[PDB]
């Protein structure tokens, strides 16, 4: 079951400049930063609030680490801005299987590693009225 | 201060078809629907979760009622997709004034009515690294 907005993915050319913009303008601190070599992105999560399902809502600021990354190619085409939205669930595997069975294109055959040890998958934006959509389960405890 | 993600604003050609997609695919349902002739939209709010500041987070699906709308013009140029993000605050007026004073332009000189009797304003996307950013104070 999708029970929260987990994050908004925001692509930027310069992660350190964009992080400083969110910090200086709104007072939002970096919760966690990491590099995902497989995706070719450096990410900063800014925690905005906690959620009623036990999770949290973040801004996920993303910079490409190389030209051949999905995010680097998206930025070259569209400029900086909102890249994707993410919904949280206790069961990414079951939800992804349910949505694939409805005919939605699921970009990965199985969930992959995401921010802070999460497991994630994506839905094709052309099946989601133009919105690149991520499904997220937080790290297991 | 900005204490939650209040909503994601998603522009679409056909609100009813888009709502059915979110209902059928994710099991979301419509919390509130309204026609706003000032903004020139029809909008549906789908409540996804409650938030730790006492508010809630929504998807806001927006269809144009006329082509001379911020949203109607944006769809012609961009196609369907994410149009804005919105942050909740207890005092939209105070936070907009503080943010203007930092050099980020505010699109309205005074806040306007938004969905569900909220009080809203927007920050200029070219001052926000390409993200059209709304500030929202919910009704009592
Ligand atoms: Co993400
Ligand atoms: Co809005």
Fold of B1-140: 2,3-Dihydroxybiphenyl 1,2-Dioxygenase; domain 1 (3.10.180)
Q: What is the resolution of this structure in A?
A: 1.4
In angstroms, what separates the C-alpha of B95 from chain A's closest C-alpha?
Answer: 9
Q: Where are the alpha helices (DSSP H) in chain B?
A: 15-26, 70-78, 92-101
Using a CB-CB distance cutoff of 8 angstroms, which residues of chain B are in contact with residue A135? none
Angle at B96 between CA B140 and CA B67, to 5 degrees: 85
Dist. CA A17–CA A58, nearest whole Å:
18
Using a CB-CB distance cutoff of 8 angstroms, which residues of chain A are in contact with residue B52? 49-51
Q: Which helix (H) or strand (E) holds A73?
A: helix A70-78
CA atoms in the 13 A half-sphere facing the CB of B53? 19
- If you ran DSSP here, which 8-state letter would residue A114 be given? -
Contact check, Cβ <8 Å, A104/B131: no
Active site residue A38: no
Tokens of residue A116, six digits: 């802070």
- Domain covering A1-141 in this structure, CATH number: 3.10.180.10
In angstroms, what separates the C-alpha of A73 from chain B's closest C-alpha?
Answer: 16
Tokens of residue B9, six digits: 């604003």
Contact B107, B120 (CB under 8 A): no
Tokens of residue A37, six digits: 């070599």
Q: Which residue pairs, CB below 8 angstroms and at least 24 apart, start in B12-18?
A: B12/A129, B12/B61, B12/B62, B12/B63, B12/B75, B12/B80, B13/B63, B13/B75, B13/B80, B14/B63, B15/B42, B15/B43, B15/B44, B15/B61, B15/B62, B15/B63, B18/A129, B18/B61, B18/B63, B18/B80
- Counted residue by residue, chain B has a size of 140
**Exposure string over A125-139, b if 16+ CB within 10 A, otherwise e:** bebbbbbbbbbbbbe
Tokens of residue B8, six digits: 């994601």
Contact A104, A95 (CB under 8 A): no
The residue with tokens 């050319």 is A13
Strands B81-89 and B2-11: antiparallel
């Amino acid at each position: 079951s999708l029970t929260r907005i987990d994050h908004i993915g925001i692509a930027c050319h310069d992660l350190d400049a964009t992080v400083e913009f969110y910090r200086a303008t709104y007072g939002f601190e970096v919760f966690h930063t990491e590099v995902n070599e497989e995706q070719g992105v450096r990410e900063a999560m800014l925690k905005i609030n906690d959620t009623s399902d036990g999770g949290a809502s973040y801004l996920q600021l993303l910079e490409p680490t190389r030209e051949d990354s999905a995010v680097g190619k998206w930025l070259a085409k569209n400029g900086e801005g909102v890249h994707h939205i993410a919904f949280g669930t206790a069961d990414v595997d079951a939800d992804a299987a349910d949505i694939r069975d409805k005919g939605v294109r699921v970009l990965y055959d199985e969930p992959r590693r995401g921010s802070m040890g999460s497991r994630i998958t994506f839905l094709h934006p052309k099946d989601c009225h133009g919105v690149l959509t991520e499904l997220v389960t937080s790290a297991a405890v």
